[PDB]
Amino acid sequence: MELFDENYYAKAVANIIGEVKDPIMYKWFSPDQIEDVDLQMGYQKTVKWDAFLNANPTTIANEVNTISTIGFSSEVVRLNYLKLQYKFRHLKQTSEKFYTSDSYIGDINNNLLPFAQAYKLASSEIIKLINHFVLTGTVSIQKDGKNQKRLLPNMYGLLNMPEQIKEEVASGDKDKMDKIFEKIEAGLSKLELGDEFSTPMMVIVDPATSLKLVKPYACEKWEDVLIQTIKAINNREDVYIETSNLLKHKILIYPLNSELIKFKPSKYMLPTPNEQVDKDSTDVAHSYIDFVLGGLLATRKTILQVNIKQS
Amino acid sequence: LFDENYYAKAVANIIGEVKDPIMYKWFSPDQIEDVDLQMGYQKTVKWDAFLNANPTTIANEVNTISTIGFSSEVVRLNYLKLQYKFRHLKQTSEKFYTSDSYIGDINNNLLPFAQAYKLASSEIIKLINHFVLTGTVSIQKDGKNQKRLLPNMYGLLNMPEQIKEEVASGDKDKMDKIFEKIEAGLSKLELGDEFSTPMMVIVDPATSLKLVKPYACEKWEDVLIQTIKAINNREDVYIETSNLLKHKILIYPLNSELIKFKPSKYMLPTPNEQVDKDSTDVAHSYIDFVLGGLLATRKTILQVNIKQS
Amino acid sequence: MELFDENYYAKAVANIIGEVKDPIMYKWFSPDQIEDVDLQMGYQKTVKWDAFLNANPTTIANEVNTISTIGFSSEVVRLNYLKLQYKFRHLKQTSEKFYTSDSYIGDINNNLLPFAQAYKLASSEIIKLINHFVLTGTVSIQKDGKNQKRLLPNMYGLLNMPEQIKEEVASGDKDKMDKIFEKIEAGLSKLELGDEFSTPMMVIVDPATSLKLVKPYACEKWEDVLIQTIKAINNREDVYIETSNLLKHKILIYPLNSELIKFKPSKYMLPTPNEQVDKDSTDVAHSYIDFVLGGLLATRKTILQVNIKQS
Incomplete structure (x- = not known):
């Protein structure tokens, strides 16, 4: 500080x-892969049918009445939607005159802001949390990822979607592209x-993986080789590469096709103010x-996750 | 608003119907100036000029002229916000208590909002008068269990850097x-240079009784008035008695250039918008x-304390 | 200093x-006693005309042409006027928008003020100095009263006017009313x-003299006795008593009559701005x-000045 009038x-x-900005998860999906549903809390159920062979086929020679059978099965796919809420403190509207000036927007000493500013900041934080959920599939506020909120079944993300393809690179070969x-x-x-192979593909990588990819191939780059490899399986359609700081030593590959991966979020998923406002005799x-x-709904063996173990 | 609230x-x-505060009689109209504040502080800057040397005579040619300097002094006055709560009858329920002579429950000591607000405001005004006179906030006759206040929040009696005189307990009854x-x-x-100003004296009832005794056919009050007139350029001297003082004598000038009262415009009792409601009638x-x-110039207030022990 | 944002x-x-207030010297003169003159520096000569009777009047009876005469006389008095100047620094007009906020007037750190405020303060100080000169007749800025500026002849105040009545109270009787x-x-x-005795009288005393006056007379007061004594000689008209901190162990008594004492100040006696303004490339x-x-003009033996020697 200063001993004269520095003010x-x-x-x-x-x-x-x-400023409240659009979620970054929109870059992870195609416009036709997202369809809103009107449900704040509950479930959506669909029914799918399948057939299978029980035994080898039967040879029709001479007389026979015992024939091998083809079985059928039904599956119920359920999507769970859960409502969550946060609370924040702010200045009372009739107190901004005494708690706000032309040089101060709020109470800096006690970190108390007007409703608009506080709501904007809280909405930004909540949208960050929503993006993290849509990517990882968990809800936590810790860097370790522990103390996760216990969520309902059938609430998965791209990274934890079950029955998908997972590859594990060893710790010793981490540098080995x-x-x-x-x-x-x-x-x-x-x-x-x-049959939906002819579709654009999306790859999401971490910054360290991008640095490793922009190295020469053991001219042509590792990124070019990877793009050609993915084109070989998607019938030489568009292959997009995105870097996300959310991931760490993770590579996610999935198609941008609504038939294979679909997103049906609630129309009230994004943050919304509540009508209840707590007031008292004070200014808070x-x-x-x-x-x-x-x-989030996905087909099996359509998401590839490569995890580079560090230990 | 009146249609809804x-x-x-x-x-x-x-x-x-709320009576005016009695502290207004301790100040002149020019001494009081409101400020727009609720809680915080107000910096007051006083600017002064001084003469560095004797003036320069303008004769023939000269380039070196005597200078006039300037200086500033900063004063910080703290303001504090306080609140009280009271229970009253509900407007929609007053009709079930409107007796022919009055409204309310004598058994339960429950009053209509208007009367309750008036009485509470009067009590709070009395407390404010006590604070302004003494500089302390208390509700006991002993004056103890004082509320702790911020620094730079002083009254007329506890203002620092003033003149303090103490009369020994042995001389407690010797005028x-x-x-x-x-x-x-x-x-x-x-x-x-501001000595030409009316003066104000505030005494406790015991000192007021002692003043009307014959001077040791003249009275001690007359002698005191003449002595103060000897220093205030023979202008008005006012004498007041307050039951809020105990063996204290306060003497100060009623000059806006020396003592100034700059209260908040919200100092007097004001309703709060919040009203607690439930399913009952309370x-x-x-x-x-x-x-x-309260702002005062240094060494401008005389405070005499007559020790009782 | 508080370590939080106290601002x-x-x-x-x-x-x-x-605010530039009226000079206190006006209280020492009647409205008729003050008359402005048009001058800045030098000397101005005033002529007083006078008349007298040479003999007893003549009785107009029958024929006569030898009549008694009325003679006339003149007296010339020279008054000196001195011009004095002061200099003060202030903010340049174009720098006010940069040096003045809504909560500031000027540099509190450097004690720099705009022209209006600086001029008002300087004018108040100069008016105080002028009052001191008019009362005492000396120019000084020290409480001791030393380092006096040498003044022109025929320039006197009430206290040092020559050819007046001077009384001295010995040091042994400095506390004997x-x-x-x-x-x-x-x-x-x-x-x-x-013949001008029927006039109001003015008395000026120091604070110590006032303290002594309010003492009981040795139930009458010394002040009352003095007022009665002055009323004995002024045809029992008004007697005003004033106290001034500019005096020290001095008592001044004089009439408020324009026929005996007059004040003819220059019409530029009170502070006036000069046209010259020093400017440079800086903001000062x-x-x-x-x-x-x-x-100040006085007739002979119409002012009583009592000095109480302290040692």
């Missing part, structure tokens, strides 16, 4: 409150796109924000 | 000794007020 | 500048008002203030 020299002041690409090729071969009020989680 | 309408209709202490304090008063209301804002 | 709580700013009153009686006896400018001293 006299503060000729102008600037406040950065940010040849081993990494070998694992990627193995997973890509294990991919099963069926409380408000609530609601958001809905759940709605 | 009944409590605001009632406060507006009854606000004229000659008390007047000797008063003369010493008046001599030590420093009013400078509701709660809140009254806010603000304390602080 | 946030500074929600009100009040700036005390004062009876001796002081004896000296005052002697001076009042030596006063010479002539300088200005000058002019004032004129002199113009």
Whole structure:
């Protein structure tokens, strides 16, 4: 600090409150892969039918009445949507006159802001949490990832979607892009796109993986080789590469086709203010924000996850 | 607002029946100036000029002229916000208690909102008067269990860097000794060029009783008035008695250039918008007020304490 | 100093500048006694005309042409006027938008003020100095009263006017109000008002003298006795008593009659801005203030000055 009136020299002041921006998860899906549903909390159920062979076929020679059978089975696919809410404190509207000036937007000492600024910041944080859920499939506020919120069944993300393809690169060969690409090729071969193979593909990588990819291939780059390999399986359609700081030593590959992977979020998924406002005789009020989680549906053996173990 | 909020309408209709604070009689109209503040502080900057040397004679040619300097002094006055709560009858339920003579429950001591607000405001105004006179906030006759206040929040009696005189307990009933202490304090008063101003004296009832005794056919009150006129350029001297003082004598000038009262414009009791409601017929209301804002020049107040022990 | 943002709580700013008030010297003169003159420096000569009777009047009976005469006389008095100047620094006009906020007037760190406020403060100080000169007749800025500026001849105040009544109370009787009153009686006896005795009188005393006066007379007061004594000689008209901190162990008694004492100040005696303004490439400018001293006129033996020697 200073021992003279340093406040006299503060000729102008600037406040950065940010701005609520579109979720980055929109870049992970195609426009036709997202369809909103009107359900704040509950489930959506669909029925699918399948057939299978029980034994080898029967030879029709002479007389026979015991014939091998073809069995059928039904499956119920259920999507769970869960409502969640947060609470934040702010300045009462009739108190901004006494708690706000032309040089201060709020109470800096006690970190108390007007409703608009507080709501904007809280909405940004909640949208970050929603993006993390849609990617990883878990809800936690810790870097370790522990103390996760216990969620309902059939609430998965791209990374934890079950019955998909997972490859594991060893800790010793972490620097070895040849081993990494070998694992990627193995997973890509294990991919099963069926009749929907002719579709654009999306790859999401971490910054370290991007740095390793932009190295020369053991001219042509590892990224070019990977793009050609993915084109070979998607019938030489568009292959997009995106870097995400959310992932760490993870490579996610999946098709941008609505028939294989679909997203049916609630129309109230994104943060919404609540009508209840807590007021008292003081100058502090409380408000609530609601958001809905759940709605990612995917086919098996259509998502490839390459994890580069560090130990 | 009056169509939607009944409590605001009632406060507006009854606000004229609240008596004026008695602290107004301790100041001149020019001494009081409101400020727009609720809680925080107000920096007051006083600018002064001084002469560096004797003036320069303008004769023939000269380039070196005597200079006039400038200086500033910064004063910080703290203001504090305080609140009270009281219970009252509900407007929609008053009709079930409107007796022919009055409204309310004598058995349960439950009053209509207007009367309850008036009485609470009167009590809070009395507390504010006590604070302004003494500088402490308490509800006991002993004056103890004082509420802790912020620094730079002073009253007339506890203002620092002023003149303090103390009369020993042995001389507790000797008006000659008390007047000797008063003369010493008046001599030590420093009013400078602003000495031509009316003066105000505030005494406790015991001192008021002792003043009307014959002078040791003249009275001690007359002697004191003449002594103060000897220093205030023979202008008005006013004498007041307050039951809020105990063996204290306060002497200070009524000059806006030396002592200034800059209270918040929300100092007097004000209703709060929040009203507690439930399913019963009892509701709660809140009254806010603000304390602080006395500014005095150094060595301009004489405070005499007559020790009882 | 508080380690939190205490400037946030500074929600009100009040700036005390004062105001150029009327000089206190006006209280020492009647409205008719003051008459402005048009001068800045030098000397002005005033002629007083006078008449007298040479003999007893002549009875107009029958024929006569030898009549008694009325003669005339003149007296010339020279009054000196001195011009004095002061200089003060202030903010340049174009720098006010950069050096003045809504909560500031000027540089509190450098004590730099705009022209209007600086001029007002300087004018107040100069008016105080002018009052001191008019009362005492000397120019000084020290409480001791030393380092006096040498002044022109025929430039006097009330206290140092020559050819007046001067009484001295010895150091042994510096605390004897009876001796002081004896000296005052002697001076009042030596006063010479002539036919203008029916006039209000003015007395100026120091704070110590006022303290002594309010003492009981040795139930009457010394002040009451003095007022009665003065009323004995002024045809029982008004007697005003004033106290001034500019005096020290001095008592001044004089009539408020324009026929005996007059004040003819220059019409530029009070502070006036000068046209010259110092400017440079910086944000600091300088200005000058002019004032004129002199113009007290008194008849002989109409002022009583009592000095109480301290040692």
